[PDB]
Amino acid sequence: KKTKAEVMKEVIAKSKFYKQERQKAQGIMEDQIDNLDDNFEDVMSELMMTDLDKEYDIKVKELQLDKRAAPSDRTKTEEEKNAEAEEKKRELEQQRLDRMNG
Amino acid sequence: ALPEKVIKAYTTVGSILKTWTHGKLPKLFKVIPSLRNWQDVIYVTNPEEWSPHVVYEATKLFVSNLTAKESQKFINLILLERFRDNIETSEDHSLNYHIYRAVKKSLYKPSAFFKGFLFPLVETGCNVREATIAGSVLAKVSVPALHSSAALSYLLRLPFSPPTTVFIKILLDKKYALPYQTVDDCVYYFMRFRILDGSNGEDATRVLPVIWHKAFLTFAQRYKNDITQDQRDFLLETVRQRGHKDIGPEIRRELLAGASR
RNA sequence: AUUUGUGGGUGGUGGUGCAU
């Protein structure tokens, strides 16, 4: 009975959400039908009418003129690099052995 | 004074945008970007009450349709107000995914981000959480290298601040094109941050944060070849004056082993 | 005139005990 009540509550909440969505859709439809043209005519009849920018333009011009990049990656430990190399070599050896066998 | 039909249409469009989170946009929102009085249309529609997905869709439509200066002004106003409202409403100062998508669209708009949005937030003095969110957004999505170097040189020419320092750290992590003038602006920022033993300064003798220390470490690791011999000596003097314990050693090693321009 | 042919990074808008 608790599970059935849960199912019923879920269905009721879904129905409420669907009703709200339908209401919102109807409102949006009425808006796009009338208020769209209204606001369009109103906006057509209406009217609605630098140091950082200068520095940015100067910097952009400078960067376009000259460029010097050297994004070197972080150097790992020598022991870690040796371990990685050994792992790669061991993987290669195991692959070769697997090729020789199967 | 706007007309009664104008006010009713704008209020209905604002209510529809507030009540809608998915689906299709209305013809009012589809024809609002084709007019010239978009600022007055938005002021009558009151976009400070819409939802995050609606704000993201409006920002995407503005970046797709509108022009440079109008898009910059609208993006500045709407994005600053919505980001401040979201950061105030979130008790832990967290951002929304649709707000992050709208910020990504406003950053893809090149003129609307640095001249309109990023400069106004730094001028309004965003907090450390907002500066970290902006740095995360700038590390996730990357704008053009010209606008990136422009924002970096602007934050270097501007005074010391938490948002400006976080922006400089994000720019040093992105590692865009650093020209001779951009490296000179970064060196001028470093010289204004370093102490002057006749006229001293608050930024000259103030304490720097760990974000500024990591920014200086990344700048010494990346743009060492953009600094000359005298600039490398000035960076070493700054690392001797206002250096650190663990991050400062790699910074001094990079400033001593880096090439010269 | 943003995108194309080639290299290329890839786990924390992390849960997290507890002390401060």
From Swiss-Prot, chain A:
Protein family: Belongs to the NOP14 family.
Subcellular location: Nucleus, Nucleolus
Organism, scientific name: Saccharomyces cerevisiae (strain ATCC 204508 / S288c)
Record note on quaternary structure: Interacts with snoRNA U3. Interacts with EMG1, MPP10 and NOC4. Component of the ribosomal small subunit (SSU) processome composed of at least 40 protein subunits and snoRNA U3.
Residue numbers of the full-length protein present here: 204 to 316 of 810
Disordered: annotated span: 62-94
Name recorded for this polypeptide: Nucleolar complex protein 14
Its job: Involved in nucleolar processing of pre-18S ribosomal RNA. Has a role in the nuclear export of 40S pre-ribosomal subunit to the cytoplasm.
From Swiss-Prot, chain B:
UniProt main location, coarse: cytoplasm
Modified residues (Phosphoserine): 199
Taxonomy, superkingdom: Eukaryota
Compartments where located: Cytoplasm; Nucleus, Nucleolus
The entry's keywords: Cytoplasm, Nucleus, Phosphoprotein, Ribosome biogenesis
Record's GO cellular component terms: 90S preribosome; cytoplasm; nucleolus; nucleus; preribosome, small subunit precursor; small-subunit processome
GO molecular function: snoRNA binding
GO annotation (BP), single: poly(A)+ mRNA export from nucleus
TM region positions: none
Task performed by this protein: Required for normal export of the pre-40S particles from the nucleus to the cytoplasm. Its subcellular location and association with pre-40S subunit shifts from mixed cytoplasm/nucleus to all nuclear in RPS19 disruptions, suggesting it acts after the ribosomal protein.
Family recorded in the similarity comment: Belongs to the bystin family.
Remaining remarks: Present with 21600 molecules/cell in log phase SD medium.
Annotated protein name in UniProt: Essential nuclear protein 1
Gene it is expressed from: ENP1
